Short mmCIF file of C-alpha atoms and ligand atoms in Angstrom, two decimals:
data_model
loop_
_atom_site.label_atom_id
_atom_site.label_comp_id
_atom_site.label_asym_id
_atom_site.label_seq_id
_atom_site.Cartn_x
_atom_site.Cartn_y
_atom_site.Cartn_z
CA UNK R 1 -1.84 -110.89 -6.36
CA UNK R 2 -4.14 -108.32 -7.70
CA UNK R 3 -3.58 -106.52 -10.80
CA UNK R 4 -3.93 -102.79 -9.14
CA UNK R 5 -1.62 -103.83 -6.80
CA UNK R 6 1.25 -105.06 -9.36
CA UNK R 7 0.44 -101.64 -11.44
CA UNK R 8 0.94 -99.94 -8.39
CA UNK R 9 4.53 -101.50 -7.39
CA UNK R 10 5.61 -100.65 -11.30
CA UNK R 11 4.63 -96.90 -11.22
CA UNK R 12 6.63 -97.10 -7.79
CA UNK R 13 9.27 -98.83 -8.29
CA UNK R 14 9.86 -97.00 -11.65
CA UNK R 15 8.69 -93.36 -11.27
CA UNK R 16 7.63 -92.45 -7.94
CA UNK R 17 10.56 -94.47 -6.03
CA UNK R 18 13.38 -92.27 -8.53
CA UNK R 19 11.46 -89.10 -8.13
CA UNK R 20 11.86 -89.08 -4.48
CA UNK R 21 15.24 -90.12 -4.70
CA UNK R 22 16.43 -87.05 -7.06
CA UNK R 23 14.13 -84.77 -4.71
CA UNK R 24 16.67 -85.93 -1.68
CA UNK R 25 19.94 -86.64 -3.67
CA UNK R 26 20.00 -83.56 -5.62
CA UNK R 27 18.13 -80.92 -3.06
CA UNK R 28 15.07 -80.68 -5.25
CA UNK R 29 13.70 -80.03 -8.51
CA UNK R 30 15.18 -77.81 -10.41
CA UNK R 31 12.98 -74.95 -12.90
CA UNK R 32 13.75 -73.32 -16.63
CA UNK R 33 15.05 -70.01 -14.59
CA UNK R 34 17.22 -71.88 -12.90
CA UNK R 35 15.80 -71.81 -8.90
CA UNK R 36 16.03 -74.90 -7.65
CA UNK R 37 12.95 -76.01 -5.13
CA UNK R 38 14.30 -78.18 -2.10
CA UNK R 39 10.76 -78.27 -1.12
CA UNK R 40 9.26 -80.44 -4.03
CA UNK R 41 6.60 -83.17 -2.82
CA UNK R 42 4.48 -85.48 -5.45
CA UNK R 43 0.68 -85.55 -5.81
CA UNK R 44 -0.93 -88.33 -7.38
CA UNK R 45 -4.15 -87.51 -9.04
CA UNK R 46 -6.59 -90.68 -8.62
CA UNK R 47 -9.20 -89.78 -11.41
CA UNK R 48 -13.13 -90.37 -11.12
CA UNK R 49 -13.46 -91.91 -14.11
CA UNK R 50 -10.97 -93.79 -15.75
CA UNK R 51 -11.55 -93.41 -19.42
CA UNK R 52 -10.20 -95.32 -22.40
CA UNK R 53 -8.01 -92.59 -24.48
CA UNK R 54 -5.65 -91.44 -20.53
CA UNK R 55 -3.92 -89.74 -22.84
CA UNK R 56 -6.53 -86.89 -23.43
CA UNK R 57 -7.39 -87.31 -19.64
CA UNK R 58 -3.88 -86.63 -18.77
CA UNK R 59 -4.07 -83.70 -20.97
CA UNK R 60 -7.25 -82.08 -19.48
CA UNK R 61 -6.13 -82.24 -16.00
CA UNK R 62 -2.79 -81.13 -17.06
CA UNK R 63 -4.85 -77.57 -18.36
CA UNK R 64 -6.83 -77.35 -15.29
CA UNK R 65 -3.96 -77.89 -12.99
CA UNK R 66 -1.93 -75.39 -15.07
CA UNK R 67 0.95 -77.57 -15.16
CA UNK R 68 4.40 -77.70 -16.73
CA UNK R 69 6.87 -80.07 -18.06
CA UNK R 70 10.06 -80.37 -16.08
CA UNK R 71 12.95 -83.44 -16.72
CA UNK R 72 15.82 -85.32 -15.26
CA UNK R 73 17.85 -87.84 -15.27
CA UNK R 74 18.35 -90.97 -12.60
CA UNK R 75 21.76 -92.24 -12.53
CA UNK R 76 21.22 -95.77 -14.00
CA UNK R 77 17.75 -95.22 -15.44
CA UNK R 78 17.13 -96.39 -19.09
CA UNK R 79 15.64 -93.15 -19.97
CA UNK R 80 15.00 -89.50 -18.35
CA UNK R 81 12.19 -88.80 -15.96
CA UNK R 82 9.23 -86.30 -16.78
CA UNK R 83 7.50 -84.51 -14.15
CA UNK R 84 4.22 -82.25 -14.50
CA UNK R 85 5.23 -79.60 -12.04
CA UNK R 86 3.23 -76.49 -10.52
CA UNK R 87 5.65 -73.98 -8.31
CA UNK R 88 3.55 -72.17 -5.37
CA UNK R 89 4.78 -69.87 -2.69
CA UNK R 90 8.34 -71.23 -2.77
CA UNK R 91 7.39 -74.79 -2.93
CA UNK R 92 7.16 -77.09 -6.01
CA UNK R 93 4.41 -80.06 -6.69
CA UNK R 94 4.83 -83.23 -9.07
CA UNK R 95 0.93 -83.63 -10.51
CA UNK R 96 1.05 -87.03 -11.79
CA UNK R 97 -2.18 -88.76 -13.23
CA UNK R 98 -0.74 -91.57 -13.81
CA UNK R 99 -0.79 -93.38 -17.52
CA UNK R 100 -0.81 -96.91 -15.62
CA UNK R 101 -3.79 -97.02 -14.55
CA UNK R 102 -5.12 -97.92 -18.70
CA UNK R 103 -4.54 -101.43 -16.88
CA UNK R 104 -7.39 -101.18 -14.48
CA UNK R 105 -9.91 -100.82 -17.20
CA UNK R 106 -8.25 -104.35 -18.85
CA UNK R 107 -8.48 -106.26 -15.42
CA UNK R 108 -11.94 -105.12 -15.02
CA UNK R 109 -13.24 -106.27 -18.39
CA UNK R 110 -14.06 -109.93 -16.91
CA UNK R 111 -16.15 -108.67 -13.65
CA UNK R 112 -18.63 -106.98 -15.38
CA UNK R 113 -21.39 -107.65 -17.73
CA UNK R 114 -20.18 -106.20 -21.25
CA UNK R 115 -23.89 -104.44 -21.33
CA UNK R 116 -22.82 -102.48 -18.45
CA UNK R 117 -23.08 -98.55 -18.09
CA UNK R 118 -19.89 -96.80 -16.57
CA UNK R 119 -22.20 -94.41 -13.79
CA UNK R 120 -23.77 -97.51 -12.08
CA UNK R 121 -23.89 -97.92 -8.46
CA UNK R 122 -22.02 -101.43 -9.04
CA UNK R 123 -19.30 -100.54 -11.69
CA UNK R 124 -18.37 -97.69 -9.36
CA UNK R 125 -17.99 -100.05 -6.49
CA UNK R 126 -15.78 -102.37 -8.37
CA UNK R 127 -13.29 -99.65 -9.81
CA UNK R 128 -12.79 -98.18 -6.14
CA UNK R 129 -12.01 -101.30 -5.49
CA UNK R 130 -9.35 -101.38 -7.82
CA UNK R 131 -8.29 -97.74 -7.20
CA UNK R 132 -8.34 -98.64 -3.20
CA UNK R 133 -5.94 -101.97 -3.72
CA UNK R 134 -3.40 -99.20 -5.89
CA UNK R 135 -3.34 -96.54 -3.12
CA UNK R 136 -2.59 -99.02 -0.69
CA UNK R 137 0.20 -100.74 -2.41
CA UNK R 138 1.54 -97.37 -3.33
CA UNK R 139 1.54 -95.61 0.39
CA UNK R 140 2.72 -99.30 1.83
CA UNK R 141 5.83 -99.52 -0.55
CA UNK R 142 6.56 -95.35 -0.26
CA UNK R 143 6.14 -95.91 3.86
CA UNK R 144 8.73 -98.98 3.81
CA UNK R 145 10.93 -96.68 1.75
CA UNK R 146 10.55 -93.77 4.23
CA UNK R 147 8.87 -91.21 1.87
CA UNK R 148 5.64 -91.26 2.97
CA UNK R 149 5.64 -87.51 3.43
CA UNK R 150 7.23 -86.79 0.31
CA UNK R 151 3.74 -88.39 -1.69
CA UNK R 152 -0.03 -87.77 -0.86
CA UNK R 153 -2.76 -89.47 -3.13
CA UNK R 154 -5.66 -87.49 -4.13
CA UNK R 155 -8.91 -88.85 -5.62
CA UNK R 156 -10.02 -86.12 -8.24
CA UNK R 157 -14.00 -86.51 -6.56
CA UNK R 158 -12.05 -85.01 -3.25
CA UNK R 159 -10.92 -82.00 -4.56
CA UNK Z 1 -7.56 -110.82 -14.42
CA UNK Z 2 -3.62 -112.01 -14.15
CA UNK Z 3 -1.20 -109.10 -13.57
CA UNK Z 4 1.08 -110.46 -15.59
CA UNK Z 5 -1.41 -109.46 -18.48
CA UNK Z 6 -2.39 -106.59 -17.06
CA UNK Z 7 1.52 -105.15 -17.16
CA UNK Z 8 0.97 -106.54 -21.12
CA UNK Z 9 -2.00 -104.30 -21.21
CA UNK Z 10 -0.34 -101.03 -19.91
CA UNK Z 11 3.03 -102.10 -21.97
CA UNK Z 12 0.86 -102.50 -25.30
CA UNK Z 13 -1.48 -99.11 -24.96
CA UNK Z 14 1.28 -96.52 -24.01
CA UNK Z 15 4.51 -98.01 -25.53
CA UNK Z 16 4.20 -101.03 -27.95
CA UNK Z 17 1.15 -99.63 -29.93
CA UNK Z 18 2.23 -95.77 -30.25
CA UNK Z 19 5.34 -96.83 -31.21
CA UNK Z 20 3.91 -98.96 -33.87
CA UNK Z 21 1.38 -96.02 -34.86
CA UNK Z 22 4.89 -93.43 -35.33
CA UNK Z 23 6.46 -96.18 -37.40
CA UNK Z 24 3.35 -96.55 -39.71
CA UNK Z 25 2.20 -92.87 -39.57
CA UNK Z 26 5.90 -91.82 -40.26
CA UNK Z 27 7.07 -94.62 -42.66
CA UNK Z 28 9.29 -95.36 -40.06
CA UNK Z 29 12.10 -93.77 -37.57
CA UNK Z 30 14.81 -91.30 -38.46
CA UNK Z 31 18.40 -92.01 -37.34
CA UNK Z 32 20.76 -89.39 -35.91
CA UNK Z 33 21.86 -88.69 -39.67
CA UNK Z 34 18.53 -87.93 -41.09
CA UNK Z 35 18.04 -91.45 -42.93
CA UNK Z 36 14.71 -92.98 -42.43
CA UNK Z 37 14.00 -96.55 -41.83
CA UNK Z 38 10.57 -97.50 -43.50
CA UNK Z 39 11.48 -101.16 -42.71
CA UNK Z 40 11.09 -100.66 -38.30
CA UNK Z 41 10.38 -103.41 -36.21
CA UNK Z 42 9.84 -103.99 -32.69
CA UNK Z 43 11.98 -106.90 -30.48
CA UNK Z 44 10.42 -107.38 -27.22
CA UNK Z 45 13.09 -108.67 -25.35
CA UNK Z 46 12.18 -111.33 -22.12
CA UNK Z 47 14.87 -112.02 -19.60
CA UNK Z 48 16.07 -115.48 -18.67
CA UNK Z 49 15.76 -114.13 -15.08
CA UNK Z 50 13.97 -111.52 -13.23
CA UNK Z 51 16.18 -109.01 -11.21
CA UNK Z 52 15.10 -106.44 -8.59
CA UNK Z 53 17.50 -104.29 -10.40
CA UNK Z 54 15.56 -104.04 -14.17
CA UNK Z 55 17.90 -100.47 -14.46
CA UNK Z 56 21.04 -102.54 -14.46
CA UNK Z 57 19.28 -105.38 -16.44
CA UNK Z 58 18.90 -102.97 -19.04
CA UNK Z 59 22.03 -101.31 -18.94
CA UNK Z 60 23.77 -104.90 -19.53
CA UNK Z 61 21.97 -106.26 -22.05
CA UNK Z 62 21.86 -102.51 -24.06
CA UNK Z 63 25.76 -103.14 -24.05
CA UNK Z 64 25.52 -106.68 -25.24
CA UNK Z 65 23.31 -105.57 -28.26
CA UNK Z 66 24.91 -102.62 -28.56
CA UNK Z 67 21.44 -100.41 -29.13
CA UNK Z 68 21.32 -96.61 -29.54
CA UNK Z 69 18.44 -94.60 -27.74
CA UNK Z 70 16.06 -92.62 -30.45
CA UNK Z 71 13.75 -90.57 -29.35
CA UNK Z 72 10.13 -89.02 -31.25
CA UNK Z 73 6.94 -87.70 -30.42
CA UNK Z 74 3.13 -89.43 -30.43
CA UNK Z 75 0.78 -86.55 -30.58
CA UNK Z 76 -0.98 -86.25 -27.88
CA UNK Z 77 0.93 -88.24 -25.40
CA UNK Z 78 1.94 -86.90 -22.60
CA UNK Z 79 5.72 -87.61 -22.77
CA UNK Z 80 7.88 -88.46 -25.64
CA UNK Z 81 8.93 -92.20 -26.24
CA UNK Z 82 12.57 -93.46 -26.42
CA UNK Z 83 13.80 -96.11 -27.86
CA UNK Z 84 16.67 -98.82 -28.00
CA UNK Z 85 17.67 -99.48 -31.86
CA UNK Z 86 19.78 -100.94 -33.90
CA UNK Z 87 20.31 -100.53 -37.50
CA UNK Z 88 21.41 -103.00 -39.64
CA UNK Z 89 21.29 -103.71 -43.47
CA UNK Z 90 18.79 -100.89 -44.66
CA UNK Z 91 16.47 -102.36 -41.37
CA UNK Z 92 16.03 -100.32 -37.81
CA UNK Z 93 14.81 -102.69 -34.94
CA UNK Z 94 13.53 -101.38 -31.60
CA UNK Z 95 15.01 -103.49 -28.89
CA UNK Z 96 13.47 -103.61 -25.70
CA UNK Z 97 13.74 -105.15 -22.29
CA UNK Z 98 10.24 -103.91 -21.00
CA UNK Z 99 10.62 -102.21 -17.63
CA UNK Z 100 7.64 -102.95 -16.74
CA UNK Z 101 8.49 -106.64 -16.06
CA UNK Z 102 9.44 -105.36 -12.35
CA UNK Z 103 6.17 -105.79 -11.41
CA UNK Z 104 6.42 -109.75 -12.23
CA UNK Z 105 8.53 -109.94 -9.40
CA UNK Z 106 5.91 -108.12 -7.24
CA UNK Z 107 3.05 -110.29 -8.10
CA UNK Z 108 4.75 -113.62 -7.64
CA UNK Z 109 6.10 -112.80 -3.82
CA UNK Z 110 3.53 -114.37 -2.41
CA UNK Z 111 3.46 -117.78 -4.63
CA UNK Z 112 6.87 -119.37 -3.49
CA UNK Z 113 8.40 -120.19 0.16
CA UNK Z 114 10.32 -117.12 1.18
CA UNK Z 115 13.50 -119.37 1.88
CA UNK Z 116 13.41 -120.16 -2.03
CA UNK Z 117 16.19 -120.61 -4.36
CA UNK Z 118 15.70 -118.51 -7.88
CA UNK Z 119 17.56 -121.28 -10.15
CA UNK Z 120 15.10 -123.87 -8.64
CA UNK Z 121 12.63 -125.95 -11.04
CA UNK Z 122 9.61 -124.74 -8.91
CA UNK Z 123 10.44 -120.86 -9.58
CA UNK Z 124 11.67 -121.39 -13.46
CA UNK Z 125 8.24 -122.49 -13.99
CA UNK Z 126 6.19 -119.90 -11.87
CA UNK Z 127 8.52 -116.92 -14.09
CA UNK Z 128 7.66 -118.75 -17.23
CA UNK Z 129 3.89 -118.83 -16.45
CA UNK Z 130 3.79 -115.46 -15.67
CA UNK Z 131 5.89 -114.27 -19.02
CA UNK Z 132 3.39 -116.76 -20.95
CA UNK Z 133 0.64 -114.95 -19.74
CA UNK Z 134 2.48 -111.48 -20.44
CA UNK Z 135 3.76 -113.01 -24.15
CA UNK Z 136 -0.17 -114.19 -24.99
CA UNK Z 137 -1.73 -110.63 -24.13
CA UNK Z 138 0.84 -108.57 -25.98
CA UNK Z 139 0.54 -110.90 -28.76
CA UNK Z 140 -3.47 -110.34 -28.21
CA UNK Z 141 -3.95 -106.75 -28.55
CA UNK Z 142 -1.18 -106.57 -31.53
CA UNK Z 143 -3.06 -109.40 -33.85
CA UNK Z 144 -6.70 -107.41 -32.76
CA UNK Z 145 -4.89 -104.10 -34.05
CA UNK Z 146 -3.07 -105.42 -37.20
CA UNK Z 147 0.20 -105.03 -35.88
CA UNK Z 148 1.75 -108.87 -35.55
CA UNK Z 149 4.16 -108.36 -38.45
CA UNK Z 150 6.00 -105.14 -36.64
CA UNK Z 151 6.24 -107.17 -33.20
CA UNK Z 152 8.01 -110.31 -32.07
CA UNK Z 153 8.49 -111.47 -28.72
CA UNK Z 154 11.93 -113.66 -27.73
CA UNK Z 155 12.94 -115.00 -24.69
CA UNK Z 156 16.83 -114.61 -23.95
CA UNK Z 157 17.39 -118.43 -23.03
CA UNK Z 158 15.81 -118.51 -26.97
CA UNK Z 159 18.75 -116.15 -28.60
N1 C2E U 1 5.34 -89.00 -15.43
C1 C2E U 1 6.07 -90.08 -15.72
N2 C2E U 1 5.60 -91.28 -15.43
C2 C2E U 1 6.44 -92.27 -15.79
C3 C2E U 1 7.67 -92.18 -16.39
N3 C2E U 1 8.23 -93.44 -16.56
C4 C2E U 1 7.34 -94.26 -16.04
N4 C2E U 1 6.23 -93.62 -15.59
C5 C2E U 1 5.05 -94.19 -14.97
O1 C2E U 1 5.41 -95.43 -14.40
C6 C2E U 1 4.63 -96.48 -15.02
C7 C2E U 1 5.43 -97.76 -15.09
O2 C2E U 1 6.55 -97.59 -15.98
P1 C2E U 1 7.40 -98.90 -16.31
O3 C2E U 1 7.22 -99.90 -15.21
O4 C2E U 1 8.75 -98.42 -16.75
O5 C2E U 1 6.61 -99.58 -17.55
C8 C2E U 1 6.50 -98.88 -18.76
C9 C2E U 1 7.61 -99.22 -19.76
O6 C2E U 1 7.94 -100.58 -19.79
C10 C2E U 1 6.94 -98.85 -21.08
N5 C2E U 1 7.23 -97.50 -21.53
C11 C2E U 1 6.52 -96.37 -21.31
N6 C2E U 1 7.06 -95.31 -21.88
C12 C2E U 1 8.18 -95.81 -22.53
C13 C2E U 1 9.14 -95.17 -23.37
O7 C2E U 1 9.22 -93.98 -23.65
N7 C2E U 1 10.09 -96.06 -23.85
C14 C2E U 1 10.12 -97.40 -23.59
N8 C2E U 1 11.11 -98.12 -24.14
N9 C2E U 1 9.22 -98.00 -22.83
C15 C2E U 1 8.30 -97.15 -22.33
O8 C2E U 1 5.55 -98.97 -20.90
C16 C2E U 1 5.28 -99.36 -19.53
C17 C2E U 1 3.96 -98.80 -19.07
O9 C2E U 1 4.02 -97.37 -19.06
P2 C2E U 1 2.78 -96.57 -18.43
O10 C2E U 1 1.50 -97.34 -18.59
O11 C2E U 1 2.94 -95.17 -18.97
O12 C2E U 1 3.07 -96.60 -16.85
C18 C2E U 1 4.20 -95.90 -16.35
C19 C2E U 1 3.90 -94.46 -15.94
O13 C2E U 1 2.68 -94.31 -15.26
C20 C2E U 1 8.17 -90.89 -16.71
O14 C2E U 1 9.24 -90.61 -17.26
N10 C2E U 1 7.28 -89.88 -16.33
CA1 CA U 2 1.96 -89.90 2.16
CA1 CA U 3 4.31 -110.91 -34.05
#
């Protein structure tokens, strides 16, 4: 259907949907000294903007969120999972921006004039769009699943 | 636009191209023994079908190629990139069966009856319309960054 939507069902059904299974199968997420956090529970950081170069936006939230890399595998996965992590109070959060969403800037290439300025009223309109049509796909596909409270979706303008 | 190029676009900007960036920055990727392949390529690999099970897909056709996992670094990316090669004849070629194709099978839910058949002539040609699209924009954003002669795209049935 909608490009945010199929972006959405990928970072799903290939990162979110195996994080929440290793939360459940293996009694959490487990940290360098060893302690091993049954209470871990993902954040997904919706960004304001959504720049071209994610991977420098990735970083800067990474240093304001004073996050860590933690990794594991998923039995049958192609490849190992990473996780920016932040341990609280006996409790441990996944702090995903997610890389995926370099696709909404492609989609929205065609729907706006190519003279247009990223702050206007309209451009703003048309990427909440986009962001609204991911969170929805993601919570609908997580609630089917039955881990809707192991993932809450944060727009960074919220915080 | 299509989110079958969309999935293109994500695929290109945080796999395909950094992985062609390593191979040119690095004159190519080392194998377990040290040796360095100037001459690396990149096979993207298209299934005949489209699974709801792209871990096992990969698993099987890993085996049939019989592809090693390397790993390396892209500076400033958030994670490190793995991938399936084989060496043959002073040549390394990256082999891979894109993940992200998952999301195909998200998209195209909605465009057949839901008592359909998968080996029917009706979904062979929705599947193929939506790889075409998928082939064209990966093939797009490689020719627009110089990087046609590290990529090529083959379809299974085609092998
Ligand atoms: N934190 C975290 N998030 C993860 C991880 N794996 C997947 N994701 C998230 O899930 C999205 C979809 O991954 P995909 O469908 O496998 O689709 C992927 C996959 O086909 C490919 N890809 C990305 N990284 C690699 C890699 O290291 N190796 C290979 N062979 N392909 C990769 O590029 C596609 C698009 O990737 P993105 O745009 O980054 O979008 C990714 C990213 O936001 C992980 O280990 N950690
Ligand atoms: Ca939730
Ligand atoms: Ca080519």
């Amino acid at each position: 259907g909608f490009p945010s939507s199929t972006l959405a069902a990928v970072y799903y059904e290939n990162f979110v949907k195996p994080t929440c299974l290793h939360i459940i199968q293996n009694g959490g997420i487990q940290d360098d000294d060893g302690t091993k956090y049954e209470n871990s529970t993902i954040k997904i950081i919706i960004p304001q903007k959504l720049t071209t170069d994610v991977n420098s936006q990735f970083q800067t939230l990474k240093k304001s969120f004073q996050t860590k890399k933690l990794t594991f595998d998923y039995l049958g996965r192609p490849r190992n999972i990473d996780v920016e992590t932040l341990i609280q109070d006996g409790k441990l959060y996944v702090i995903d921006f997610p890389t995926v969403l370099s696709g909404i800037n492609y989609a929205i290439s065609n729907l706006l004039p190519n003279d247009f300025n990223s702050m206007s009223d309209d451009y703003e309109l048309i990427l909440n769009r986009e962001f609204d049509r991911f969170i929805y796909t993601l919570n609908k596909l997580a609630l089917r699943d039955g881990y809707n409270n192991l993932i809450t979706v944060i727009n960074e303008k919220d915080i």
